[PDB]
Structure 1
Amino acid sequence: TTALVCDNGSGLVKAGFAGDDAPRAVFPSIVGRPRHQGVMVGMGQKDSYVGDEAQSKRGILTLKYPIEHGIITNWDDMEKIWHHTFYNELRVAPEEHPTLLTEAPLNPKANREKMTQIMFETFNVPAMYVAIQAVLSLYASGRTTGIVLDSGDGVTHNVPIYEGYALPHAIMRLDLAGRDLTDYLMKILTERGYSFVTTAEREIVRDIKEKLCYVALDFENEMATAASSSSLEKSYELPDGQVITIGNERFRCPETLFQPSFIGMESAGIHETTYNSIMKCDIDIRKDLYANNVLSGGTTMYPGIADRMQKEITALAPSTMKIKIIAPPERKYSVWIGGSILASLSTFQQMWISKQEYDEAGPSIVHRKCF
């Protein structure tokens, strides 16, 4: 039999089969409901659209995300998401397939327990397993040591691993990610008159971000370059027409990752939490960690982010070590790729949580050595 690999993430569902090179179903993790009245009798319209259909009916729906920061907040919505994923995108019967789920470090425990309970009671899968996103990223990267920085859409986290041993006291988790970058871009785009307030203009702003934003290698020099020239100013065409022109806020948006004070957060940038995780690890694995700094997740896809991260970590660490940043082109799907590798490993077929184990030990069996 084959196992499914559902990388829920927070803002993009990625599912597929264990043993493939890529997911076969990538769609947004949104659930939309109509907000207007509806006049044409016989239209027979539905009450809630899931996934990629909601993005077509944006102008009529209110789009809600069922996952805020890794954490699931709307369990009925999330159950709809899973039902859509199993039956409409993949077209499989979940009572014949083990399912490997992913989760971020340092989430509540009820999240994981309720996820297991759903997967066994509602969808009736034979086995299931919840994996950490950073470990799976390291599987897909081909390493066995290295400090991984998995910046998704809800959370950002560093997880240092050495020789296959993870150092839990050095795990860092930050709640700044692509969703906060989108909100900051919505906010600073009002300096030029453009206003995006609806829950469906957030998708337009996310598209603008993905297509035009980039990380500056030096922030003050790019500030001055934008103040003087106009060579970095680019245009974008809305779904309506009426092109908008983006100036220096092409690189002020992702700079929030290195200066979280822009959105009023207290914490330090990703370049500094990475270094603090290093310095919290031992002394005789720090050289390997410096040399194996692995990036994954969608928020690491900006142009120039690897070069910026290297410049910063190099200015932080001692001057005698080679600091190297691994940033594959298929970063966004690294967690899923690693999940497929892991679930196909023949050694892993004894780590599943079978259904009988659950029936006899309750949902608490998730936090056991299968953690």
Structure 2
Amino acid sequence: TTALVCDNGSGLVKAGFAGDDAPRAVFPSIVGRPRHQGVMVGMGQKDSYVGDEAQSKRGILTLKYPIEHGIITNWDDMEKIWHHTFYNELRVAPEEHPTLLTEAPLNPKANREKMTQIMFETFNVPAMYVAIQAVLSLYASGRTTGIVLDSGDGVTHNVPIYEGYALPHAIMRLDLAGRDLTDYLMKILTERGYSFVTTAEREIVRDIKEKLCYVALDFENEMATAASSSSLEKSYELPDGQVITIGNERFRCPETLFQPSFIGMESAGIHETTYNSIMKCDIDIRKDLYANNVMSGGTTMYPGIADRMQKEITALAPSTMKIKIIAPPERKYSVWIGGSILASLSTFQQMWITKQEYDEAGPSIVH
């Protein structure tokens, strides 16, 4: 019977069978719809495109992320991506597997309840479970204690975890993420003259960000040395064939995680939020958290991030103590891996919510 593990973040769906090393289907959470009413016969007609297929045809389509900052915005679009996921990639009847789904912490109750309702009623599932992302990543690490920073496309979290357990009062979410950074890279990019106005172009700049951008160790020194352009400008080539050259924009895009004032947010940088989260925890356990802080998610993938974190958190925390930061490679799939390994635990098998139990207890029992 095994299980399905579906990691539904903004920007990417990662899904696959439990007990495996990596997700088989990994595609963008997008629902493409034709921008221009098309006059042909035999075409499509394909009123709605989804996932990688939508990526193939961006210049026709308006791309629409169904899920924004972890919150589901458009429910039938989400349903569409699930249906496509199950039948067109994993090729499976949901009635044959229990399904573990994912969600961000501190996330409105409507997502869990609606989600489960869909999984039971529209797809028919024997049993399912919805899990907090950071815990899954911590399992992926193979560790029981630590503070997880999970930055995906929608949202960034800090969840401190001690010896199992958890500290809900110290959990801190922050809407800064690949989507916010891509938009910021948009408007900063436009100062070189390169105008990317459209949803489809947003995905191009996402690609630019993913390849070229890095996190500087020291910001203003790097900005100073951007004066005499040497290695800092890099050439990137668009799908059109045009050449973009980007210098300080390469590293000032991700600087926004440390300085959210660039987007005009008062929220403290990710280092201050991790630090702050540690502060909120009991005096006894802070040393372990500082030692053991973990990173997850696509927005942790910028080269340089861990080193800057180690500088900044060390600058905030008492110097007498060791702050090791653990950011393993393959960290973008940590959540999914966590899901897999959890589904492979027998002790967890009692915790699935059964179809019948949902039917008799109602929606309130997901929590």
User: Structure 2 length as normaliser, TM-score?
Assistant: 0.99
Output the CA distance in 2 between the equivalents of 1:69 and 1:231: 35
Q: 1:40 to 1:344 in 2, by over 3 A?
A: same
Using the TM superposition, give the Cα deviation of residue 43 of structure 1 relative to its aligned residue in structure 2, in angstroms. Answer: 1.9
Task: Give per-residue Cα distances to partners, 1:61-97, cap 9 Å, x unaligned.
Answer: 0000000000001000000000001000100000111
SS of residue paired to 1:117 = helix
Distance 2:172 2:95 in 1: 36
Q: 1:101 is paired with a residue of what secondary structure?
A: strand
Deviation at 1:35, TM superposition (A): 1.4
1:229/1:59 CA distance change after superposition, 3 Å? closer
Distance 2:110 2:91 in 1: 29
Deviation at 1:209, TM superposition (A): 0.3
Q: What is the DSSP-based 3-state SS (H/G/I as helix, E as strand, rest coil) of the residue aligned with 1:323? A: coil
SS of 1:59's partner is coil
Cα offset, 1:364, TM superposition: 1.2
Alignment partners' CA distance in 1, 2:229 and 2:175: 35
1: CA distance, partners of 2:42 / 2:242: 36
Give distance in 1, aligned partners of 2:152 and 2:199.
20
Q: CA deviation at 1:44?
A: 4.2
CA distance in 1, matches of 2:242, 2:69: 34
1:319 is displaced (CA, Å) by 1.0
**Structure 1 residue 41: deviation in Å?**
1.3
Task: Quote the Cα distance in structure 2 between the aligned partners of 1:165 and 1:14.
Answer: 26
Q: Secondary structure, in 3 states, of the residue corresponding to 1:240? A: coil
- Measure how far apart 1:49 and its partner are: 0.4
| Aligned 8 A contact 2:229 2:247 in 1 | no
SS at match of 1:165: coil
The structural deviation recorded for 1:365 is: 1.1
Distance 2:333 2:175 in 1: 20
1-side partners of 2:231 and 2:207: how far apart? 22
Q: For residues 119 and 317 of structure 1, do their structure 2 counterparts lie closer, same or farther at Cα, with a shift above 3 Å needed?
A: same
Which residue of the partner structure matches residue 140 of structure 2? 140
Residue of structure 2 equivalent to 1:273:
273
Residue aligned with 1:253, SS: helix
Q: Deviations over 1:178-223 (max 9, x none)?
A: 1000000000011110000011000100000001000000001100
8 A contact 2:149–2:156 mirrored in 1 = yes
Instruction: Name the CA distance, whole Å, in 2 between partners of 1:286 and 1:36.
Output: 56
Task: Mark the runs of 5 or more structure 1 residues left unpaired by the alignment.
Answer: none
What are the equivalent positions in structure 2 for 1:113-262 lying under 5 Å apart? Answer: 113-262=113-262
Task: Note the alpha carbon deviations across 1:117-148, whole angstroms, 9 max, x for none.
Answer: 00000001100000000000000001100000
Q: How far apart are residue 232 of structure 1 and its match? A: 1.1
Query: Kindly tell me: are residues 211 and 107 of structure 1, through their superposed partners in 2, closer, same or farther at Cα, counting changes over 3 Å?
Result: same
1:92-107 pair list within 5 angstroms: 92-107=92-107
**How does the TM-score come out when normalised to structure 1?**
0.98
Percent of aligned positions that are identical = 99
1:233-256 Cα offsets, whole Å, 9 max, x none, are 101001111101001110000000
Deviation at residue 36 of structure 1 after TM alignment: 1.0
* 1:215 counterpart SS class: coil
CA contact (8 A) 2:214 2:250 kept: yes
Gap change, CA 1:169 and 1:107, over 3 Å in 2: same
Any idea what the Cα deviations from partners look like across 1:271-312, whole Å, max 9, x if unmatched? Answer: 000000001101110111110010000000000000000000
Number of residue pairs the alignment of both structures matches: 367
Where does structure 2 lack aligned partners over 5 or more consecutive residues? none
C-alpha displacement of 1:230: 2.6
Aligned mates of 2:229, 2:69 — CA distance in 1 = 39
SS at match of 1:131: strand
* Distance across 2 between alignment mates of 1:358 and 1:229: 62
Alignment partners' CA distance in 2, 1:45 and 1:100: 34
**Deviation of residue 361 (structure 1)?**
1.1
**How much has 1:229 moved relative to structure 2?**
3.3
| 1:82 lines up with 2:82 in the alignment | yes
Q: Secondary structure, in 3 states, of the residue corresponding to 1:45? A: coil
Distance 2:259 2:141 in 1: 28
CA distance in 2 between counterparts of 1:24 and 1:342 reads 17
| Equivalent position SS for 2:8 | coil
Give the match's secondary structure for 1:139.
helix
Aligned-residue offset at 1:231? 2.3
Distance in 2, matches of 1:269 and 1:33, equals 36
Q: Distance in 1 between matches of 2:24 and 2:118?
A: 23
- Looking at structure 1, the residues matched to 175 and 220 of structure 2 have their Cα atoms a distance apart, in angstroms, of 26
1:38 CA drift (Å): 1.3
CA distance in 1, matches of 2:345, 2:144: 15
Q: CA RMSD in A?
A: 0.7
Q: For residue 333 of structure 1, give the secondary structure of its aligned residue in structure 2.
A: helix
Structure 2 Cα separation of the partners of residues 232 and 38 of structure 1: 43
Q: Partners of 2:195 and 2:189 in 1: how far apart? A: 7
